[PDB]
Ligand binder design. Structure first.
Ligand SMILES: Nc1ncnc2c1ncn2[C@@H]1O[C@H](COP(=O)(O)OP(=O)(O)OP(=O)(O)O)[C@@H](O)[C@H]1O
Ligand SMILES: [Mg+2]
Lengths: 150, 222, 50, 51, 117, 49, 60, 114, 100
């Protein structure tokens, strides 16, 4: 299921809520294997996606529609960078103009549940949880959920 | 088909054409390397698939560089197209300054033998490295980043000690936001740093420097 | 472990290379200064010899 | 030293610098006087004292 | 800093930075020797050797292996001691004085045992 | 000597004036910072509510 | 002779004063700047403490 | 030489030698400054800078970005031009004359433009 | 319950038995020694590990303080004291006296 009702909610790879906050009203359904936009359905990437981090925003800028890999060893700050980006989107959200707003999806694959709870708490502190959805496939989930969460 | 797994996943993040609505999805895949081995199978696949890479390093993290992004190897194939005009202008010199500083870091202690230009390069690079540091959970608005990078790259940090740069920056960003927010407005609503705004910002920086107190008491004026 | 210690040796050799190259350049400057000092000393030596 | 020994002479050793100090310490040869700490940049004061 | 406080975090970061720099300089010291470092790097190397020695401790469960009864150090004393170490307050004491001891009182007693104050 | 003494006296006077000015500026901006932080604390407290 | 000595001393004293005036100037410039910085620092510390206690009471 | 001929190979090797020795001097120049270099070293630096600038060219694709149209340089013209450059027959001209031009005719014409 | 690491490089240097002190260890410790041996050799292994560390560190130290030189000399003497020819067992009291 897919819809605006998935903002602020934690779900599993099947879309079923796990935050214990009740049902999620689905605007519609969407197959996981729908083909990507074709080479002629795109346009050049020309809009900044401000991560709020000077290093990225100055040295390795990220535009809307881009795939920027965050790669490093453990405990190097990868999740910190991603959560910083999600939090930085808050002013754009408050603008109210969809051409500026960024909805955020956080897919947590294989993390222990308390780590996901910590990330959700951090997002709540910064108010990012109003425009963020978390898809959780904790370490205790079947390999199928870990494979499907992204 | 593991490469196919990740490639089909990540090719769905795209910037649609205006006919389809103009919407976009930006992907930030995370990859954990072991022993900083980016030539492993899955890191290799994902590095091939994506547009740019931000390489985070444990050694930089321990050295105090946080976020620990290795600007030497981190790349963004989109580049300036993903930056506003003010950011592209101010950040233009960062890459070369940092590369030259990393080349000269071996000569930290021999500044007497360094020619004036090379010692200036070394000092500027030290200030710039201190500039890119950022505390956790503290994203900066693009105008704030533009002003901070302007401080770094216009030489306004040359009179400040390294150990104070960060603090200086933050306080200055506060000062402006407290009393000269029009600079932030101009930048945000025009996406460029106009000449009048630049000169006003320079005057504000100079006044703040007259006000600023270094950690060791050294004057940071001029 | 062979790869681990080989990478460690590579890192060590890289640091050694950097230090030695810096020292070589510093020694170039020092040669310049020492030759300048010899030149500065030359005239008094000539005069006292005369 | 060999030439001076051939000429029926005894070398009386004086040293400027520490590397020679270590070499002669290993050789056990006695160093009557030693000046160190200015090899990189000698001043006329050191030369005057030595002379 | 949110949980452990600003002073604890600051001291821990300083210790980690010093030890990382020492690790970086260790190979240079191995080949070229310590005399070819800058004065600040020499001070950092001495400080880092003392810090890494002081990080060791005589544990209660380890007496069977050493015969030395274990010791316990309060957190505040640990923070203060490592702040002093990173500031170079104990740079004069022999590094052996920092090996397998408890708090600062044990450090002073061991330094006295080695003929230093 | 007379001119130097006069310059010293006027420099001290101008120093006193500017010191008062910068001190009042410091008090004003410190009050502004305190009010801003208190308002932010109240706002986040309302958020927690 | 006393007049010549006095003239020399007066030139020396004028040179001393043209420097001591600016010295005292800068001295209390720095004093005022340090006092202002300390006032700002204590204001920031007070604000941080106030927000922290607000956090605590709100959580309770 | 078996494929491209003797003159082409000789000019290419001379250009490579000059550029390589300039690359060697790069580090010394950067850290210690150019004035630290000898007179022969400075002459070679000037010649190598001129050669590496002349290796630039105004590309046809560059027309869209910069209005100036691209140029095609015949191989023999390139060989003779770089033979002259390696012989110092252009050191007197300024560096700016050597950016994004074609053959010797373009070089001269831009020189009279400076 | 522990291991005695033997190294050929130590063997060729004359350290016989070629036990690598730093990495060799017994997981029983003083419980496997008589009281006298435990008293004399309480921290010998740690002493020798630290000595090897310092010797590696002071390989090209132009000078050393008094403490470092004293530790190096003591460690060298201990390393010599632990060398032993094959087929030459020492009764426990002889070992205690030697370590003392
Ligand atoms: N900019 C920063 N400044 C200070 N500390 C930071 C910063 N970024 C991250 N950290 C800290 O570094 C540690 C690791 O950060 P983080 O968990 O984000 O990294 P990671 O690479 O995602 O880790 P993991 O392998 O556990 O998933 C945490 O203590 C985090 O608080
Ligand atoms: Mg993580």
């Amino acid at each position: 299921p897919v819809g605006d009702a998935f903002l602020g909610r934690v779900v599993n790879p099947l879309g079923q809520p796990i935050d214990g906050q009740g049902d999620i009203a689905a605007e519609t359904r969407r197959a996981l294997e729908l083909q990507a936009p074709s080479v002629v359905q795109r346009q050049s990437v020309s809009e900044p996606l401000q991560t709020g981090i000077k290093a990225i925003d100055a040295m390795t800028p990220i535009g809307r529609g881009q795939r920027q890999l965050i790669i490093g060893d453990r405990k190097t700050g990868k999740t910190a960078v991603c959560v910083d980006t999600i939090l930085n989107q808050r002013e754009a959200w408050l603008t109210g103009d969809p051409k500026q707003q960024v909805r955020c999806v956080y897919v947590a694959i294989g993390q222990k549940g308390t780590t996901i709870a910590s990330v959700k708490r951090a997002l709540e502190e910064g108010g990012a949880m109003e425009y963020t959805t978390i898809v959780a496939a904790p370490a205790s989930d079947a390999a199928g959920f870990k494979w499907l969460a992204p | 088909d593991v490469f196919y797994l990740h490639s089909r996943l990540l090719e769905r993040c795209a910037k649609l054409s205006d006919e389809l609505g103009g919407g976009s999805m930006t992907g930030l895949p995370i990859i954990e390397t072991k022993a900083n081995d980016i030539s492993a199978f899955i890191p290799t696949n994902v590095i091939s698939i994506t547009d740019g890479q931000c390489f985070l390093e444990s050694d930089l993290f321990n050295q105090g560089v946080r976020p620990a992004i290795n600007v030497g190897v981190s790349v963004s194939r989109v580049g300036g197209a993903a930056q506003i005009k003010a950011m592209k202008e101010v950040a233009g010199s960062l890459r070369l300054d940092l590369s030259q500083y990393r080349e000269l870091e071996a000569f930290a202690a021999f500044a007497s033998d360094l020619d004036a230009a090379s010692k200036a390069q070394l000092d500027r690079g030290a200030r710039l490295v201190e500039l890119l540091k950022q505390p956790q959970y503290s994203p900066l608005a693009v105008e704030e980043q533009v002003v901070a990078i302007f401080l770094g790259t216009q030489g306004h940090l040359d009179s400040v000690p390294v150990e104070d740069v960060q603090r200086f920056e933050s306080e200055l960003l506060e000062h402006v936001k407290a009393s000269h927010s029009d600079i932030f407005d101009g930048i945000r609503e025009t996406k460029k740093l106009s000449e009048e705004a630049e000169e006003k910002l320079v005057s504000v920086i100079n006044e703040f420097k007259k006000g600023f107190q270094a950690s060791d008491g050294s004057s940071v004026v001029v | 472990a062979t790869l681990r210690e080989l990478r460690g040796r590579i890192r060590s050799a890289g640091s050694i290379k950097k230090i030695t190259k810096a020292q070589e350049l510093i020694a170039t400057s020092r040669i310049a200064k020492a030759q300048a000092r010899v030149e500065a000393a030359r005239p008094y030596a000539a005069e006292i010899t005369n | 030293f060999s030439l001076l020994r051939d000429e029926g002479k005894d070398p009386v050793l004086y040293v400027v610098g520490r590397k020679a100090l270590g070499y002669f310490s290993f050789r056990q040869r006695t160093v009557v006087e030693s000046w160190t700490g200015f090899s990189e940049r000698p001043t006329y004061e050191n030369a005057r004292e030595i002379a | 800093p949110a949980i452990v406080g600003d002073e604890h975090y600051r001291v821990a970061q300083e210790v980690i930075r010093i030890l990382q720099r020492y690790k970086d300089l260790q190979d240079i010291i191995a080949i070229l020797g310590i005399d070819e470092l800058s004065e600040e790097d020499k001070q950092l190397v001495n400080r880092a050797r003392r810090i890494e020695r002081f990080l060791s401790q005589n544990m209660m469960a380890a007496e069977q292996f050493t015969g030395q009864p274990g010791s316990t150090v309060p957190l505040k004393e640990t923070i203060e001691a490592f702040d002093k170490l990173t500031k170079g307050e104990f740079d004069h004491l022999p590094e052996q004085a920092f090996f397998l001891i408890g708090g600062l009182d044990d450090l002073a007693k061991k330094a006295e045992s080695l003929g230093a104050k | 000597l007379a001119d130097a003494d006069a310059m010293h006296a006027k420099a001290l006077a101008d120093a006193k004036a500017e010191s008062e000015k910068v001190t009042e500026e410091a008090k004003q901006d410190s009050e502004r910072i305190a009010a801003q932080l208190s308002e932010q604390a109240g706002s986040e407290a309302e958020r927690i509510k | 002779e006393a007049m010549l000595a006095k003239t020399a001393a007066d030139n020396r004293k004028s040179a001393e004063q043209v420097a001591a005036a600016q010295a005292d100037y800068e001295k209390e410039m720095a004093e005022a700047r340090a006092q202002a910085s300390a006032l700002r620092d204590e204001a920031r510390a007070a604000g941080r403490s106030v927000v922290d206690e607000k956090r605590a009471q709100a959580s309770g």
